[PDB]
Design a protein around this ligand. Structure first.
Ligand SMILES: Nc1ncnc2c1ncn2[C@@H]1O[C@H](COP(=O)(O)OP(=O)(O)OP(=O)(O)O)[C@@H](O)[C@H]1O
Ligand SMILES: Nc1ncnc2c1ncn2[C@@H]1O[C@H](COP(=O)(O)OP(=O)(O)O)[C@@H](O)[C@H]1O
Ligand SMILES: Nc1ncnc2c1ncn2[C@@H]1O[C@H](COP(=O)(O)OP(=O)(O)O)[C@@H](O)[C@H]1O
Ligand SMILES: Nc1ncnc2c1ncn2[C@@H]1O[C@H](COP(=O)(O)OP(=O)(O)O)[C@@H](O)[C@H]1O
Ligand SMILES: [Mg+2]
Ligand SMILES: [Mg+2]
Lengths: 1622, 128, 145
């Protein structure tokens, strides 16, 4: 009755729980408690789901299912209500607090009023009945919110121009997105909602301090908690509107900091030039003032001391008081060093670290001044230093501080920076400061350039933070166009902020030239500030940006950082480069950075540690092997140094934690004395460097570690708590867990290493070959951390290369300038907004796919310390601390150093995932997961026991796998492709035993028979899984090797390969030849497309295809064109009902969008409680996507095919992302079958190994000479039953056919011409052609048979030949072959060289005399001139042959022509003339200079309607010149092969087509009403009526390239090489 | 064709000049601690892989030019470069001066392998 | 009126500036026109059927690029700008580019400093001709420096 209690508890909770209401400005009663509502619903939903597992669920099934429906309906309603209420709050604020918007946008204002009325009406109902069930039962409440959400979104998108007007009134709004700005404007009264947006408008203001009323802004605060209290508080009541008090807050921030600086300077002067400093007073002064002012005060005091000392040294020979300046710095630095040797508050400790860094530089500068004997303040070695002059007598507090370097003078901006980590002030950084400040004085931009990881971006920000400026970083890409850059400049100019444009050379060259105009006009405006004649009490300086007059603040600056060494980057035009002063930053001063950082962190041996760690990184870059995922640069060094301080702090906390439970001897000073500082550094190195190492580099690095750090050992923490959770998660996921050298131990170490990287890096890559356990490593870790820490883990897995880069990050509208989020931007923005508590969960964004610089370099500012996603609309999204950016990849051969250096690396090797582990996983799943949806599980469990001995290490399967890798395969061989195929086949064997038990309900299979079946099937499955993608000789050779090593009984035939045997359900080997009968084919089905003559290969391939298809396993058939791949697949599908096949024809230009159109036509998207599911429209059917040329799609320059990545996503992840709404779609009842030619063929690319692990490959070769004799000997016997007197000649006719076909296939190959492909397709056409010429014939002599045989050979083999020698050879060998197999025949009457056949002079297709044909064509040409085209033609012999060839194709279904020849040879005219003779209407597209793709689509619709609906025979004649775009042929490639274009008819066009098809089918007498039935009939009409004639000139390069663009042109069209006139 | 015969002689001749053997350094507990062994082990390891790849590619070209194995996409790309005298990008594994043609690379690559052989011979016979 | 070419707005601005200038004698300079080879062909056809003011001049700035149409090159007069042939030519170009009043300011020693700068600029630029020996790399020491 425990289940009954849960139902009672669920019933009682929802009979009383009321929507918690709050009054909102006396207008309505909003709903709070969204977290309480959502968690409560989720908790009951889980409990209802969990109680289904209980066996006692049957009695309460209906009641539980009723509650599942109700709880799901509650989720679907209030997940929309929350977004509707949120949007209404800030839209209501805007449309009430700004009367100007009513006039500006009257339509939107009235539309919002109507929606605001329906919202308030629904609010009042909720107030009357706040009970959730009563609200849930409100009529149409679900649809009301759905309409409210959509309608409110339209109003939101219609306020864009209003938002652009408000951005001027507070220019920091230019750096805020439209939606966030509406929240800011609309919530101007709800100040608590404004807090999350301050980090976007300010450098270091994360929140504001408010009184209890929230009416006065008392001050500002940073993200670390540091507070600035305003001297004069800002009252919001006296300045209500949002943009004025925000301006007053920005001013008080600057005024308060300047006033606070003056007070700090007064106190710090006492510390300066003082013999002894009391630490308590000095620490008190540090704690009292902000971090930025503390360092600023120290710099001011030191500068004035040096100025004072140099002034006294005017006489030259006077004593130097500079030593006292050095003395004061030494004393102060000793106190700072002593303070960081002990525990400090986190804010004070960082302040102390900043002061140590500042004073180390002052110590170095003062030492340099003393060593150089400088005695004058005007000496350049002092002027070149950055100096700080403070005038307390200055009236304006904002101008009391002057920062001067050389001749450059700057005011301090007094932007609140919070606590920004400072750089070590190195000689490179000193040179950077000097160069950039020279550019600033010259009103020029700064252009630091160099390789990645040299400090270019950090130095620009450091200089800006030194000057108190708001520095904005932008990660530039090709989407930063002229309009986007200008708008960013407008914001920068009015705010007075610095723009640091990183990767600035990733802009297009045309955009760089255009931007140079905007940069120049700003710089001219900046020089207007510098003019002494200009007075501040005048018209403000203004430059023209985007055709508008924009005020320019003197504090703004432009900086660009670039790597000029990166190939593929844009070269800056010279006119742009003259606007920037460039500095090379190539060799950072690593040893100085390491020494100062370790000294500021409290390491006593910092000099010793720095002298070891920096050379150690240099040694690693050279001593260790070279890998693409190896980085030992400054980022890697910085990571270790920062981690060293963290490790030192935890040990000190750990040491005293031991002291708490062991005495009371806390003696912190002595604690730092006995502290293994070298061991701390080694731990940071190993926690950060070791996971990236390959196996053979691991001992090398530890030898290097012992070389540089003798006697120091690395010992990982034994993480029992995490390992216990990992072991449990592995058990629930059927995974193998090990410890140390056990099975799975290497993989568990990688999981633990991955966890360590997650705690040090916000961006990390898991790199390793396909099938290394990378995915399971982070999927298991995510679940384990959920159990260990209690924090829910959420993973968003993205295939970045399965979609366009526009769909990944988003697009800026060219005209409306509206921003649409991409997939990654939408996910990250959803987490930042945290509407449903995403900030309290562990959020992992996994980019599972290929890494190329084009898309991942948009994440440079995300993966570095900026933690910002910068968008071309000026918006900057901060990465929250709970988010990890992860990249699961198989290689990094296209990633640049910029990306590799910014990410933690965990390397997976194929040895990490052992084959024993994979075998355990398959067996564990087989013993626990039933295949039916237990008698089925009992079969699997018994079968698992039988398979177990062979699946051990060094077993049969392991030895077979090792031998298979030594063989040659049509595709690259990977371990998981074999095992994936092997496990699918064994699952089918378990289904076979169950199906046998269904056939034998009396006697189910016993273990003796079950054992006898499984062992042989396992051998059978091993051969096909490991050699099915190899040729017969390789399939044989694996057979003997198995025969040697196996103990399973095998067929005892002397010379018959094992691959020639199947396994009967009785556990006996049975030859495949028993299922290959010598059939006799019905005479009307001779060589018909659906007829398959059983051969040894067909029955084996069909059985193998059946197994994979029945398991819904994706598969690829590979073989030469025409080898029978489509025939075998469709033959196997006939024995597999409940499966519909849809043929897709890939080209070089095929994108995932071709798959999406097929989904739109055959499948529906439905909203389910678990997400969007895509399933076939027809119920109970599995829909098979057949891709015929899956390896043709273009491979980009980074080795990626987008559609292949898209298919890999749908197979491995079971779905894809819908780019319109950024929503994951799950596939249901959809499987994929691929066909392709071998990757070595021209135009073919190798398939990705990450796609092949899911897709078993079967190799279908050309039938051999004996197989061809069996196939077409059967056809010839059937077709020669038409003439009983010709039955005897069946065998010689087949032999002549096979001999000439084999000779032609050898004689002409793809090496000579790209279209010289001969396959059994020609044999099928050969038999069909003879059969068509024999049906209306009552009798025929044997010489008449040879003439038809010779005629069809010429049409099939000679018509495609280019050269006269080739045509001469074909003509001669036709005679040779015929007489060899047909002696005692009259050669002349059978082989007269002018072989012409026509049905023009009679009812039948009989031979025609050349002169008789010439007279008839002249007679018909006379009529043709008077009716269609009055262009006289001269009739020569080749024309008569050509018109007969065209006439043949127009009389065949799907008769398509590829006419190749020189222009003006009559290809079009003859086609029209023959089309007029056969009753075919001629359609030609009427191209012009403005003819575009949608013009071609409309033209395609016109032809398809006429031929598909009106039953009109049409010759669609189209030239190569008509192809104005590659998209034209992607449509024709589908049309030629399938007679249909999946996406051509959409919207109203499809509806009109259905009306016309229903009318058209009615005139034919067919009873069709279903749209699917109508579309199939429409396709069948297009197949029989539409004829496409393609005309093109002979171009060797063009013809070869043409095959990839339109493969249907060369396998669905008959090619006739008309060439030039002879 | 004329190119097919001329390229056959060149590839066969290159297989004569380029050495055929390169034995990896035997890793030892006390050899890993030797910095010279650590650098020299890298040289042979990357050198042996490049040596096998070039020899295999050249052997396939000879067999192609004898009409015994069919021309694949990789072979078509490699054969086109060899006819034009451009150094194949697959062969390019160590930094070289810009504008270096394939005939100079083969002679340069042959000398580097000889030195690599002597270094491994000393390590094999005599120790690190 | 000076216009950069790459932007779509730049094309519209160029046409309006040219149309206004051909009726008033105004000067128009279009920079980096090699970035728009297709638009350059249309500009050549536009200039052919036009009889502007006698003082009108159109300046096109481009890099030496094979993408520049032949028809435009034939219609215009080409001036090649490159490093001066030698030290003498380099220094004469420098002294012509700097206004005389700039050198001849109150400190008489300013003239010798400019000469030293001109000599230094000539020597540094001429060493670039010796690609490897003069400097390890082909630095872009130029007018901005
Ligand atoms: N620890 C483990 N124990 C047992 N089986 C495992 C383990 N880890 C992975 N496997 C299995 O072995 C295979 C490894 O797949 P996984 O997704 O982990 O590899 P991957 O390297 O991420 O793959 P890809 O390169 O295709 O992205 C799967 O069949 C998986 O079920
Ligand atoms: N002078 C310095 N002091 C401290 N850290 C530095 C210094 N210069 C660079 N770094 C660090 O080096 C890494 C790379 O700096 P970054 O500015 O991103 O380089 P770049 O822009 O050249 O790629 C960062 O971790 C940065 O903080
Ligand atoms: N056993 C067979 N029975 C009937 N036709 C066969 C047989 N083997 C080969 N063929 C012929 O070979 C051709 C194969 O065509 P298809 O299946 O489209 O080839 P692919 O898919 O390899 O491009 C057809 O003409 C088919 O009739
Ligand atoms: N057999 C012919 N006799 C006379 N004129 C011909 C003949 N074939 C073509 N022409 C001429 O060439 C023109 C172009 O014919 P068309 O069919 O468009 O050529 P193609 O398709 O080969 O480019 C015709 O309009 C006609 O003037
Ligand atoms: Mg940078
Ligand atoms: Mg994976």
């Amino acid at each position: 009755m425990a289940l009954e209690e849960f139902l009672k508890q669920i019933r009682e909770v929802w009979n009383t729980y009321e929507l918690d209401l709050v009054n909102y400005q006396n207008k309505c009663r909003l709903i709070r408690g969204w977290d309480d509502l959502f968690n409560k619903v989720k908790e009951h939903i889980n409990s209802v789901s969990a109680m289904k597992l209980s066996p006692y669920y049957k009695v309460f099934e209906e009641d539980a299912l009723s509650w599942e429906d109700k709880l799901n309906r509650i989720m679907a309603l209030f997940d929309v209500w929350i977004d509707v209420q949120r949007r209404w709050v800030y839209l209501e604020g805007i449309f009430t607090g700004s009367a100007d918007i009513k006039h500006l946008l009257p339509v939107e204002t009235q539309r919002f009023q109507s929606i605001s009325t329906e919202f308030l009406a629904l609010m009042k109902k909720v107030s009357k009945s706040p009970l959730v069930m009563d609200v849930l039962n409100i009529q149409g409440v679900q649809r009301s919110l759905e309409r409210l959400a959509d309608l409110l979104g339209k109003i939101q998108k219609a306020l864009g121009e209003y938002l652009e007007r408000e951005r001027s009134s507070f220019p920091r709004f230019y750096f805020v997105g439209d939606e966030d700005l509406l929240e800011i404007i609309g919530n101007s009264k709800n100040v608590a909602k404004l807090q999350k947006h301050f980090k976007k408008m300010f450098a270091g203001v994360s929140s504001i301090i408010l009184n209890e009323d929230n009416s006065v802004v008392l001050g500002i605060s940073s993200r670390e908690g540091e507070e600035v209290m305003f001297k004069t508080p800002v009252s919001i009541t006296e300045h209500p509107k949002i943009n004025e008090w925000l301006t007053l807050v920005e001013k008080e921030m600057r005024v308060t900091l300047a006033k606070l600086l003056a007070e700090s300077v007064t106190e710090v002067e006492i510390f300066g030039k003082a013999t002894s400093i009391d630490p308590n007073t000095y620490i008190t002064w540090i704690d009292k003032y902000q971090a930025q002012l503390v360092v600023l005060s120290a710099q001011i005091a030191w500068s004035e001391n040096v100025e004072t000392a140099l002034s006294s040294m005017g006489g030259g020979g006077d004593a130097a008081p500079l030593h006292s300046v050095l003395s004061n710095v030494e004393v102060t630095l000793n106190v700072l060093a002593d303070s960081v040797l002990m525990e400090q508050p986190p804010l004070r400790r960082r302040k102390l670290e900043h002061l140590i860094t500042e004073l180390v530089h002052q110590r170095d500068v003062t030492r340099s001044l003393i060593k150089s004997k400088i005695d004058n303040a005007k000496s350049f070695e002092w002027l070149s230093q950055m100096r700080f002059y403070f005038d307390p007598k200055q009236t304006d507090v904002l101008q009391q501080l002057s920062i001067q370097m050389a001749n450059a003078k700057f005011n301090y901006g007094f932007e609140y920076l919070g606590v920004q980590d400072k750089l070590v002030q190195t000689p490179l950084t000193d040179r950077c400061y000097l160069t950039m400040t020279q550019a600033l004085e010259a009103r020029l931009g700064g252009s630091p350039f160099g390789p990645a990881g040299t400090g270019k971006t950090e130095s620009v920000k450091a200089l800006g933070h030194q000057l108190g400026r708001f520095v904005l970083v932008f990660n530039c890409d090709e989407t930063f166009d002229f309009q986007a850059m200008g708008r960013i400049f407008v914001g920068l100019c009015q705010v007075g902020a610095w723009g640091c444009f990183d990767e600035f050379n990733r802009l297009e060259e045309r955009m760089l030239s255009a931007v140079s105009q905007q940069v120049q006009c700003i710089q001219e405006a900046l020089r207007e500030h510098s003019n002494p004649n200009y007075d501040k009490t005048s018209a403000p300086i203004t430059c023209e940006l985007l055709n508008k007059q924009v005020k320019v603040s003197p504090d703004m600056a432009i900086f660009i950082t670039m790597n000029p060494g990166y190939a593929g980057r844009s070269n800056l035009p010279d006119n742009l480069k003259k606007l920037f002063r460039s500095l090379a930053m190539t060799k950072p001063d690593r040893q100085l950075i390491a020494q100062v950082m370790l000294y500021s962190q409290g390491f006593r041996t910092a000099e010793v540690l720095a002298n070891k760690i920096v050379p150690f990184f240099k040694l690693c870059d050279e001593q260790l092997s070279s890998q693409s995922h190896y980085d030992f640069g400054l980022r890697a060094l910085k990571s270790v140094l920062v981690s060293a301080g963290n490790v030192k702090r935890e040990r000190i906390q750990k040491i005293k934690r031991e002291k708490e439970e062991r005495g009371e001897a806390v003696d912190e000073g002595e604690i730092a004395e006995n502290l293994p500082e070298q061991e701390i550094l080694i731990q940071s190195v190993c926690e950060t460097m070791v996971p990236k190492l390959v196996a053979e580099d691991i001992p090398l690095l530890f030898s290097l570690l012992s070389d540089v750090f003798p006697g120091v050992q690395y010992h990982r923490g034994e993480m029992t708590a995490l390992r216990e959770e990992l072991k449990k998660v592995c058990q629930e996921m059927y995974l193998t867990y090990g410890d140390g050298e056990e099975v799975g131990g290497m993989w568990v170490e990688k999981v633990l290493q991955l966890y360590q990287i997650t705690q040090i890096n916000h961006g990390l890559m898991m790199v390793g070959p396909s099938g290394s356990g990378k995915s399971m490593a982070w999927r298991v870790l995510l679940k384990a951390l959920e159990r260990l820490e209690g924090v829910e883990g959420v993973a968003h897995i993205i295939d970045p290369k399965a979609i366009s880069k526009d769909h990944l990050y988003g697009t800026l509208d060219p005209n409306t300038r509206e921003w649409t989020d991409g997939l990654f931007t939408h996910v990250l923005r959803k987490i930042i907004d945290s509407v449903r508590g995403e900030l309290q969960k562990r959020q992992w964004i996994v980019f599972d796919g290929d890494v190329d610089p084009e898309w991942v370099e948009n994440l440079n500012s995300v993966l570095d310390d900026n933690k910002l996603l910068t968008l071309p609309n000026g918006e900057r999204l901060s990465l929250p601390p709970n988010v990890r950016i992860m990249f699961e990849v198989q290689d990094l051969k296209y990633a640049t150093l910029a990306t590799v250096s910014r990410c933690g690396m965990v390397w997976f090797s194929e040895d990490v995932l052992s084959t024993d582990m994979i075998f355990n996983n398959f067996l564990a799943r087989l013993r626990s997961i039933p295949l039916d949806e237990s008698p089925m599980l009992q079969i699997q469990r018994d079968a698992a026991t039988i398979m177990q001995p062979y699946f051990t290490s060094n077993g049969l399967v392991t030895k077979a796998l090792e031998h298979a890798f030594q063989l040659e395969h049509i595709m690259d061989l990977t371990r998981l492709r074999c095992l994936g195929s092997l496990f699918s086949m064994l699952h089918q064997a378990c289904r076979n035993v169950a199906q046998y038990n269904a056939n034998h309900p009396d006697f189910p299979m016993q273990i003796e028979q079950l054992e006898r079946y499984i062992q042989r099937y396992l051998v059978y499955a091993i051969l096909w899984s490991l050699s099915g993608d190899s040729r017969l000789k390789m399939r044989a050779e694996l057979g003997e090797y198995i025969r040697r090593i196996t103990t399973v009984p095998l067929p005892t035939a002397p010379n018959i390969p094992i691959i020639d045997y199947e396994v009967s359900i009785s556990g006996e080997w049975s030859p495949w030849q028993a299922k290959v009968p010598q059939i006799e084919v019905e005479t009307h089905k001779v060589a018909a497309p659906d007829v398959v003559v059983p051969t040894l290969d067909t029955v084996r391939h069909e059985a193998l295809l059946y197994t994979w298809l029945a398991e819904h396993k994706p598969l690829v058939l590979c073989g030469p064109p025409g080898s029978g791949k489509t025939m075998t697949l469709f033959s196997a599908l006939r024995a597999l009902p409940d499966m519909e096949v849809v043929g897709l024809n890939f080209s070089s230009a095929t994108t995932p969008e071709l798959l999406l159109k097929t989904f739109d036509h055959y499948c529906e998207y439905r909203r389910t409680p678990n997400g969007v599911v895509l399933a076939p429209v027809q119920l109970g059917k599995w829909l098979v996507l057949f891709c015929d040329e899956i390896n043709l799609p273009d491979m980009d320059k980074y080795g990626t095919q987008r559609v292949i990545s898209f298919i890999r996503q749908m197979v491995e992840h079971g779905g894809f992302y819908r780019t319109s709404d950024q929503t994951w779609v799950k596939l249901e009842r959809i499987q994929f079958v691929g066909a392709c030619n071998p990757p070595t063929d021209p135009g073919r690319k190798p398939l990705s190994h990450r796609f092949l692990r899911h897709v078993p490959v079967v190799y279908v070769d050309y039938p051999g000479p004996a197989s061809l004799t069996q196939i077409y000997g059967t056809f010839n016997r059937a077709m020669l039953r038409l003439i009983p007197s010709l039955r005897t000649y069946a065998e010689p006719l087949t032999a002549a056919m096979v001999e000439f076909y084999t000779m032609s296939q050898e004689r002409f190959t793809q090496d000579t011409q790209p279209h010289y492909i001969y396959s059994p397709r020609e044999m099928t056409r050969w038999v069909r052609g003879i059969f068509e010429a024999l049906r209306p014939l009552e009798t025929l002599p044997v010489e008449g048979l040879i003439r038809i045989w010779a005629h069809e050979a010429l049409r099939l083999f000679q018509d495609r030949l280019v050269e006269d020698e080739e045509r001469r050879w074909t003509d001669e060998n036709i005679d040779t072959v015929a007489l060899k197999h047909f002696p005692n025949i009259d050669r002349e009457k059978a082989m007269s060289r002018p072989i012409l056949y026509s049905n023009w002079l009679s009812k039948d297709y009989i031979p025609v005399d050349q002169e008789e044909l010439r007279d008839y064509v002249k007679a018909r040409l006379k009529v043709f001139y008077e009716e269609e085209l009055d262009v006289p033609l001269v009739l020569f012999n080749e024309v008569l042959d050509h018109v007969l060839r065209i006439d043949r194709i127009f009389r065949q279904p799907q008769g398509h022509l590829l006419l190749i020849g020189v222009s003006g040879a009559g290809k079009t005219t003859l086609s029209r003339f023959v089309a007029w003779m056969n009753g075919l209407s001629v359609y030609q597209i009427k191209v012009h200079r403005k003819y575009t793709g949608e013009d071609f689509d409309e033209d395609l619709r016109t032809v398809l309607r006429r031929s598909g609906c009106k039953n009109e025979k049409i010759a669609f004649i189209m030239d190569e010149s008509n192809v104005l775009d590659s998209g034209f042929l992607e449509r024709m490639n589908t049309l030629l092969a399938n007679g249909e274009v999946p996406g051509l008819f959409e919207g109203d066009e499809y509806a009109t087509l259905m009306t016309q098809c229903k009318e058209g089918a009615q005139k034919e007498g067919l009873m069709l009403d279903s749209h699917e039935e109508l579309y199939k009939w429409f396709t069948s009409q297009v197949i029989r009526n539409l004829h496409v004639v393609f005309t093109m000139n002979p171009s060797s390069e063009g013809l070869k390239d043409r095959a990839a663009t339109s493969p249907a042109l060369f396998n669905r069209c008959v090619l006739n090489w008309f060439g030039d006139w002879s | 064709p004329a190119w097919m015969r001329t390229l056959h002689t060149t590839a066969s001749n290159w297989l004569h000049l380029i050495p055929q053997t390169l034995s990896h350094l035997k890793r030892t507990v006390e050899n890993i601690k030797d910095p010279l062994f650590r650098f020299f082990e890298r040289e042979v390891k990357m050198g042996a892989k490049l040596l096998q790849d070039v020899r295999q590619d050249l052997a396939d070209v000879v067999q192609v030019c004898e009409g015994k194995k069919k021309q694949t996409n990789y072979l078509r790309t490699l054969i086109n470069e060899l006819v034009k005298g451009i150094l194949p990008r697959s062969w390019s594994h160590y930094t070289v001066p810009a504008g270096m043609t394939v005939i100079q690379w083969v002679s340069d690559f042959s000398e580097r392998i000889k030195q690599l052989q002597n270094i491994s011979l000393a390590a094999a016979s005599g120790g690190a | 009126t000076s216009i950069a070419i790459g932007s779509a707005e730049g094309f519209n601005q160029a046409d309006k500036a040219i149309n206004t200038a051909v009726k008033s004698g105004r000067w128009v300079m279009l920079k980096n026109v090699h970035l728009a080879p297709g638009w350059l062909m249309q500009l050549e056809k536009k200039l052919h059927s036009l009889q502007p003011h006698a003082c009108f001049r159109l300046f096109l700035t481009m890099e030496i690029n094979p993408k520049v149409p032949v028809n435009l090159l034939r219609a215009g007069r080409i001036f090649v700008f490159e490093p001066p042939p030698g030290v003498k030519a380099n220094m004469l170009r420098t002294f012509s580019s700097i206004p005389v009043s700039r050198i001849c300011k109150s400190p008489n020693e300013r003239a010798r400093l400019y000469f030293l700068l001109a000599w230094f600029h000539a020597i540094i630029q001429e060493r670039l001709r010796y690609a490897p020996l003069g400097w390890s790399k082909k630095y872009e020491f130029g007018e901005s420096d």
